[PDB]
Amino acid sequence: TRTLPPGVSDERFDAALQRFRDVVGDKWVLSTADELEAFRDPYPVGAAEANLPSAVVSPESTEQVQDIVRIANEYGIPLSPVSTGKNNGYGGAAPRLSGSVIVKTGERMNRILEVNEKYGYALLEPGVTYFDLYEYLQSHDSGLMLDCPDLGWGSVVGNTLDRGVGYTPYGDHFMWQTGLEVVLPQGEVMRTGMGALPGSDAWQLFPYGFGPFPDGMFTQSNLGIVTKMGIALMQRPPASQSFLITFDKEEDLEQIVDIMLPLRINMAPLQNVPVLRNIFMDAAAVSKRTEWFDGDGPMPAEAIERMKKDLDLGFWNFYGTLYGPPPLIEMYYGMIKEAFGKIPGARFFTHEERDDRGGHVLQDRHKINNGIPSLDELQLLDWVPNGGHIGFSPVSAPDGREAMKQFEMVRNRANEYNKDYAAQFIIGLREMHHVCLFIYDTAIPEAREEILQMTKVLVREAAEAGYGEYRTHNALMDDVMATFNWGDGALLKFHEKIKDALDPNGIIAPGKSGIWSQRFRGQNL
Amino acid sequence: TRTLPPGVSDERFDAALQRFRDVVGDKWVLSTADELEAFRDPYPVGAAEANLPSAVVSPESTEQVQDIVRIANEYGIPLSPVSTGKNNGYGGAAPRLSGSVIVKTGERMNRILEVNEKYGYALLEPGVTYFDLYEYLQSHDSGLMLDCPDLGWGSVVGNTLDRGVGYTPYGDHFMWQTGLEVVLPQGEVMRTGMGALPGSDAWQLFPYGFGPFPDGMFTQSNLGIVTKMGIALMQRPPASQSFLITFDKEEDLEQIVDIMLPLRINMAPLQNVPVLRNIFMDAAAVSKRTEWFDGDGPMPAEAIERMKKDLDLGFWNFYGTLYGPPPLIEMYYGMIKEAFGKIPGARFFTHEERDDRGGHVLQDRHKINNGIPSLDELQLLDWVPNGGHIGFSPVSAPDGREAMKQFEMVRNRANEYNKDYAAQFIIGLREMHHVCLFIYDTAIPEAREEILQMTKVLVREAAEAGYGEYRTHNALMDDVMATFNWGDGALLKFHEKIKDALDPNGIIAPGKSGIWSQRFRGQNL
Ligand SMILES: *Cc1cc2c(cc1C)nc1c(=O)[nH]c(=O)nc-1n2C[C@H](O)[C@H](O)[C@H](O)COP(=O)(O)OP(=O)(O)OC[C@H]1O[C@@H](n2cnc3c(N)ncnc32)[C@H](O)[C@@H]1O
Ligand SMILES: *Cc1cc2c(cc1C)nc1c(=O)[nH]c(=O)nc-1n2C[C@H](O)[C@H](O)[C@H](O)COP(=O)(O)OP(=O)(O)OC[C@H]1O[C@@H](n2cnc3c(N)ncnc32)[C@H](O)[C@@H]1O
Ligand SMILES: COc1cc(/C=C/C=O)ccc1O
Ligand SMILES: COc1cc(/C=C/C=O)ccc1O
C-alpha cells in the first residue's frame, strides 16, 4: 500500500511529483516501492514499519532546492533533507515523519567548491564524502588533513549538521564549521557569516559575521536545507604515532577516566580525541559473536575472558594518537605511560608493535586519527546475522564515577533485554560522548522491538540520573527532547516558536529533534 | 524635556516606572536627567544628541528580570539590557533606541555562582567583571586563568554577548562560552545546552545539548536578557614570555602579516592572540598628541619619526606571548625571531629586556596575555582633551595585501577627516579583527560629526571592497547591517522574522545590530 504525505491524496501527490520532475528531471525523482526500499532505515528499530518515505528528489543546484521547497509549500508536502543519507544508528536516510519526501542533496550537489591551502579550509556541497575529500587532498598533494568519523562514506556536511564527531584535534566538526548556505523553509536562500557580505573572501575565515549568530540553529534542526558549508582543515603534522592501552578489568573504567582528565583538558599530552572502547566493541570489529559464545543470552564471563585472551586486549582499550616532531611525541608518550601505568594490568602498544588480529582496531584508529578514512568498522555489523546498530549516546562528565555509573546503568538494561553493550567513550576536553552501540539482528521483529523498548527505557533512566543524549535515532527524538524540559519545556517551546515563524506551512523535516510544526503538534506520529 | 519611550505618554511612563519600582525597589530605578547623565554614551558620536535612555532599572534576580519584561510588554516600553554597560567605543551603556529603559543587570546580579577547578569553568552572573573574577581566582589560589580584554572593568558576560575578544589562547570569548540562561522577550526563562536537562552537571561541560543550538542567537542580539552564562577557563601554564617586534616602515605591514600566517594557523609557535599595533596606538597609550605635534591637521612624517625615535618603537609593533615549559618557549621564540627577522629593520624585545616608557605597552600586554586585567589602556583617551574613541572594526583575511589595502583605505579617510588612525590588528587563526580606533575630542560638535560621517563612509567603502565589520557602534548598526545584504537582504529578513516571533510587542533593544521589530521598522528611530 502506497506511502503518501499526511493528508495529501494520491492525485495531489502525483501532481507534485510531476512538478518536482519539471525542476530536477525525471531520472532524479524516485517514487516506486522498489526504488524506495533503499531509503528505508537499514537498521530498523521497533517491530512495526516506521519512517517510510513517499519519494526521493535529487536536486543538482541551490535554485532547484528553492523550487522544490516552493512546490512543497504549495502542496503541503513535508521534505526531509539529507546529504548522503548515511546516518545509520540514527535512522539512515529515513524521515522522522512517514510520508515525507527525502531531498537527497548529495546525489548531485557533490562538488568540492574550494580547498584553500593557504588558509586551511574547504567549501563543500553536501555530497562530498570523506573519501571524496581525502582523494582530492591526496591528488593535489595537499598539506591539509581532514577529520573523519569511523566510517568515511558519509558527508563532511551531513555529519557536521548532526554535530557528529571525529578523532583528530579537529574532531568537533561543528566547532570547525565556518559559513553556510541554506534554503529556508519557504524557499528563500541565505548565507551566514561573512558570506552575507557580497564579495567577501572571508566566508570560511571568520564564522560569526555581524549580528545574531545563527549557524548552530541549522544543526540537529529542521529550519532549512543546507546547500553549501565551509569547514576549517588542519595542517598535517610532520609525524604521528598511535597507541593502545589495554586495561584488564571492567572495574578499571573509573581510574582510567580520572587519570585521563588532567592529561587531556589542556590538549596535551593527549592531543587527539582519545577513545575508550570495551572488549565488545573491539571483538565485534574483528570477529563474530559465535566465535566466543553460541547462546541467545548474555555472554558468560569465561567467554569474555577468552575474547580478551585470544585478541590480547583488555576489557577497556584506550586508543590515542600523538602528533608533532618525534622528540615531542616521545615526551608526550612518556607522560601517558607514566600516568596510565599506575593502573595494575595496563599494557601499552604503539601502532608499530601489533600485527595480530586484536591489533586491527589500533591500525584502523591510526588511519582515522590521521584523517585517512576507512570502512573497516562496518565489520561490527557481522557480529550477528543481518546486523544492525542503534546509537544510544549520553554525554558524560569526564569523571570516572560518572562513567562507571552510566556503564553500569546501560549494562544492566542491556542484559535485561538481551543485547550486547559495545561502548565507545569519545573524549572531548571537558566532556565525553558515551556512545553505546547495540548490535542486533534486524530481521527478527522481537529483536527490533526489544531494541526500541530497551532504548526508550535507557533515555528515561539516564534523564532521571541527570544525563542527556547528544544525538539520537528517529525513534527516540520525541523521548530525548522530552528530557530537556527544564522550566516546563522552555527549550522546546522556544524551538517551536522559531519553527512556526520560519515554516508556517510545516514543510521541513517535521519532528526532527522532537520539533513539530503547528499542524502536526498533539498527534501520534 | 523628558526623554520618553516612543508612543508612550508621560502619564503611562510614570505608571510603568512605579511598577518597575514595585519589582526592584525605589532606590533601583533611576529616572532624573541628573541620574541618567552617567548612562549617556561617554564617547558620543554625531553632533546631534542621540541614544538617550528614559530610565535605568537594576534588578536583583532572574525573577525580577522576568517581572520587568512582563511590565514592559504591558506598557509597550522598550528595554535595553546591559551587563556592566562599559561598551565604550560602541555606545557605552546608551541604548540604540532613544527612550528605551536600560536594564542594568550587572549592578546587583554580580555573583560568581561557581568556579570549578577540576573541569575548568565558571558560571557567572552579568555583573562579574574581569577584575572580580581575577580576584576570586587569586584569593582561592586557583590553577585557572581568565581571558580578558584590554580593560578589566567590563563584564565576562557582557563582553561575550557582544562577541568581544581577548588575547590568551582562550581569546575568542564566544567560543568558550558554555551554557546560558536567558529571559525571552515575553518573560519566559530558558536555559541552553545541557542546562535544559534538569539536574545535569554538564551545563558548562558540553555546549550543544540536543536539537538546534541557539546560544549564538543571543550574541549581538535583541532576543532576550541573559541572566547567567558559563565560560571555560584555561589552566595557567607553568611559564610564559611576552615579546615585542618593532618594524620601522608603514609599508612593512604586508610582509609582517604574510610571515605571520604560517606561524599562527597551527597555534604554534604563535600560541596566543598576537596584536599588531601602529605607533599612534602605542604613542597614545603613553603620551599626549601635543608632545609630538601641535599644529593643524594630520601629524606630519617628521613628527611621526619623532614618536618612533623617542619611544624606541616602530610604525608597527607586534606583541605576542608564549606559554609552556621553558625549553618550549625558547624553541618557539627562536622560530619567531628567525621568521620575522627577514624584514629589514625588525627589532625584538622580550618582557624581561625592556622597562622604558616605550616598553610600557609590552608590560601591559604581558599582564593581559597572562589573564591579569588592567586599566592602563584608558590612557589612550588622554591623547587629546576630552578624549573618546569609536571602533571601526573590519574583518581582514590574514593576508598582507588585504591588510595593507584596509590600512591605506582607512588612512586616506582618517587624513581627509582629520582624525588620527590608531590600528590594532587582533590575529586569530584564519582571520584578523582590524580594530581602527579613532581618538577624538568629544566636546567639539565638529569632531563628533566628522567621526560619524567618516565612519559611515568607511563602512560603505569597506563593503564596496568586500570587507565587513565584526562589531559596531550604535550609530553605525543600521549601516553595517545594510552591508550584509547578500541575496537581497536575506540575512536581515531572517533576523526580523525571528525577532517578530519572539518579541511580538517589540520590547527588547530595538535596533540592535540593525534589527528593528515590526512596530519600529521604517521610522528612522
Ligand atoms: C553504524 C555506525 C555509525 C557511526 C559510526 C560507526 C558505526 C559502525 N561512527 C561514527 C563516528 O565516529 N562519528 C560520527 O559522527 N558518527 C558515527 N556514526 C553515525 C553516522 O554513520 C555518521 O555520523 C554519518 O557520517 C552520518 O551520515 P551522513 O554523513 O550521510 O549525514 P546524512 O545522513 O546526510 O545527514 C544527517 C542528518 O543531518 C541533517 N542534514 C543532512 N544534510 C542536510 C542538509 N543538506 N540540509 C539540512 N539538514 C541536513 C538531517 O537531519 C540528516 O538526517
Ligand atoms: C575604549 C576601549 C574599548 C575596548 C578596548 C580598549 C579601549 C581603549 N579593548 C577591547 C578589547 O581588547 N576587547 C574587546 O572585546 N573590547 C574592547 N573594547 C570595547 C569594550 O570596552 C569591551 O568590549 C567591554 O568589555 C564591553 O563592555 P561590557 O563588558 O560592560 O559589556 P556591556 O556594555 O554590559 O554589554 C555589551 C552589549 O552586550 C549586550 N548585553 C550585555 N549584557 C547583556 C544581557 N545581560 N542580556 C542581553 N544582552 C546583553 C548588549 O547589546 C550590550 O550593549
Ligand atoms: C551511531 O553513532 C555514533 C557512533 C560512533 C562510533 C562508534 C564506533 O565505531 C560515534 C559517534 C556516534 O554518534
Ligand atoms: C573599541 O573596540 C575594540 C577595541 C579593542 C582594543 C583596543 C586597544 O586598546 C579591541 C577590540 C575592539 O572591538
Deposited experimental method: X-ray
Please say whether the beta carbons of B368 and B67 come within 8 A. Answer: no
Taking only Cα atoms into account, the Rg of chain B, rounded to an integer number of angstroms, comes to 23
**Grid-cell match 546560544, residue found:** B215
What are φ and ψ of residue B170, in 5° steps?
-95, 30
Please say whether the beta carbons of A130 and A153 come within 8 A. Answer: yes
How far out from the chain centre does Cα A89 lie?
8
Which residues sit opposite B436 in a β-bridge?
Answer: B392, B423
Residues B116 and B75 in one domain: no
Omega before B300 within 30 of 0, i.e. cis: no
Distance CA B431, CA B397 (A): 5
Spatial CA neighbour of B56 closest among B112, B105, B103, B111: B103
- Quickly list DSSP for B388-421: EEEEE-BEE-S-HHHHHHHHHHHHHHHHHTT-EE
Distance CA B124, CA B136 (A): 12
Please say whether the beta carbons of A439 and A366 come within 8 A. Answer: no
Query: Of A90, A130, A170, A332, which one is the catalytic site residue?
Result: A90
Residue from B162, B178, B208 whose CB has the most chain A CBs within 10 Å, to mutate: B208
Residues A149 and A134 in one domain: yes
Residues A122 and A232 in one domain: yes
Q: Which residues contact A125 (CB under 8 A, 6 or more apart)?
A: A105, A106, A109, A110, A111, A112, A113, A157, A227, A228
What are φ and ψ of residue A120, in 5° steps?
65, 60
Tally of CB atoms within 10 A around B201: 16
CATH number (domain holding residue B167): 3.30.465.10
CATH number (domain holding residue A333): 3.40.462.10
B121 contacts A197? CB cut-off 8 A:
no
Distance CA A347, CA A360 (A): 16
Distance CA B149, CA B141 (A): 22
Residues A9 and A135 in one domain: no
Task: Write out the residue range of the structural domain in which residue B67 sits.
Answer: 1-110
Q: What is the DSSP letter of B111?
A: -
Structurally, chain A folds into a number of domains equal to: 4
Please say whether the beta carbons of B304 and B250 come within 8 A. Answer: no
Residues B92 and B229 in one domain: no
Query: Of A19, A163, A289, A471, which one is the catalytic site residue?
Result: A471
Tally of CB atoms within 10 A around B140: 11
Three cell numbers at B52?
538617550
Q: How far is CA A274 from CA A153, A258, A341, B419, B457, in A?
A: 22, 14, 17, 53, 51
Q: What is the DSSP letter of B132?
A: H
Q: What is the DSSP letter of B100?
A: P
Q: Which three-class secondary structure state does DSSP give residue B478?
A: helix
Residues B384 and B493 in one domain: no
**Grid-cell match 517491530, residue found:** A47
Q: Which residues contact A415 (CB under 8 A, 6 or more apart)?
A: A298
**Grid-cell match 574483528, residue found:** A286
Tally of CB atoms within 10 A around A445: 12
Distance CA B259, CA B307 (A): 26
Residues A196 and A288 in one domain: no
Vertex B34: Cα angle to B29 and B39 (nearest 5): 65
Contacting A residues, span 187-226, partner chain B, CB-CB under 8 Å: 188-192, 194-202, 204-206, 208-221, 223
Q: Characterize A164-175 residue by residue with b for buried, 16 or more Cβ atoms within 10 angstroms of its Cβ, and e for exposed.
A: bbbbbbbbbbbb
How far out from the chain centre does Cα B123 lie?
21
Spatial CA neighbour of A18 closest among A68, A73, A80, A83: A68
Residues of A in contact with B261 (CB under 8 A): 118-119
Distance CA A303, CA A294 (A): 10
Distance CA A472, CA A452 (A): 12
Distance CA B219, CA B161 (A): 4
Omega before B394 within 30 of 0, i.e. cis: no
Cited resolution, angstroms: 1.9
Residues B214 and B319 in one domain: no
Pairing type for strands B101-104 and A189-191 reads unpaired
Question: Looking at CA atoms only, how far is residue B397 from chain A in angstroms?
Answer: 6
Taking only Cα atoms into account, the Rg of chain A, rounded to an integer number of angstroms, comes to 23
Distance CA B8, CA B14 (A): 10
Question: For chain B, what percentages of helix, strand and coil (3-state, to nearest 5) are there?
Answer: 40, 20, 40
Tally of CB atoms within 10 A around B496: 17
CATH number (domain holding residue A57): 3.30.43.10
Single out the residue in A423, A453, A470 at which a domain terminates. Answer: A470
**Grid-cell match 549564538, residue found:** B216
Please say whether the beta carbons of B157 and B141 come within 8 A. Answer: no
Binding site annotation covers A84? yes
Residues B285 and B425 in one domain: yes
**Grid-cell match 562577541, residue found:** B163
Residues A268 and A413 in one domain: yes
**Grid-cell match 560569526, residue found:** A208
The 3-state secondary structure of B280-302, one letter per residue: HHHHHHHCCHHHCCCCCCCCCHH
Tally of CB atoms within 10 A around A275: 24
Distance CA A523, CA B3 (A): 51
Residue type (1 letter), B217: M
Instruction: Find the DSSP H helices in A234-348.
Output: 253-264, 279-286, 301-311, 326-340
Please say whether the beta carbons of A82 and A106 come within 8 A. Answer: yes
Residues A324 and A454 in one domain: yes
CB burial of residue A496 (10 Å; 0-12, 13-18, 19+): middle
Spatial CA neighbour of B3 closest among B70, B97, B140: B97
Angle, in degrees to the nearest 10, between helices A279-286 and A360-368: 100
Query: Which strand (E) or helix (H) includes residue A490?
Result: helix A486-502
Single out the residue in B181, B211, B237 at which a domain terminates. Answer: B237
Q: Which three-class secondary structure state does DSSP give residue A386?
A: coil
Query: Which strand (E) or helix (H) includes residue B456?
Result: helix B445-464
The 3-state secondary structure of A108-130, one letter per residue: CCCCEEEEECCCCEEEECCCCEH
Ligand closest in space to the Cα of A151: 1
Ligand 3 atom closest to the Cα of residue A380 is: 9
Pairing type for strands A29-30 and A387-392 reads unpaired
A217 contacts B485? CB cut-off 8 A:
no
Distance CA B85, CA B92 (A): 6
The 3-state secondary structure of A214-247, one letter per residue: CHHHHCCCCCCEEEEEEEECEECCCCEEEEEEEE
Q: Which residues contact A515 (CB under 8 A, 6 or more apart)?
A: A221, A222, A481, A492, A495, A496, A499, B211, B212
Catalytic residue flag (residue B111): no
Angle, in degrees to the nearest 10, between helices A253-264 and A400-416: 140
Residues B373 and B488 in one domain: no
Query: Which strand (E) or helix (H) includes residue A320?
Result: strand A316-323
- Ligand 2 neighbour B85 (Cβ under 6 A): yes
Distance CA B289, CA B384 (A): 6
Please say whether the beta carbons of A295 and B264 come within 8 A. Answer: no
Single out the residue in A110, A139, A170 at which a domain terminates. Answer: A110
Query: Which strand (E) or helix (H) includes residue B114?
Result: strand B112-116
What are φ and ψ of residue A102, in 5° steps?
-80, 130
Instruction: Find the DSSP H helices in B106-264.
Output: 130-139, 156-161, 173-176, 253-264
What are φ and ψ of residue A493, in 5° steps?
-60, -40
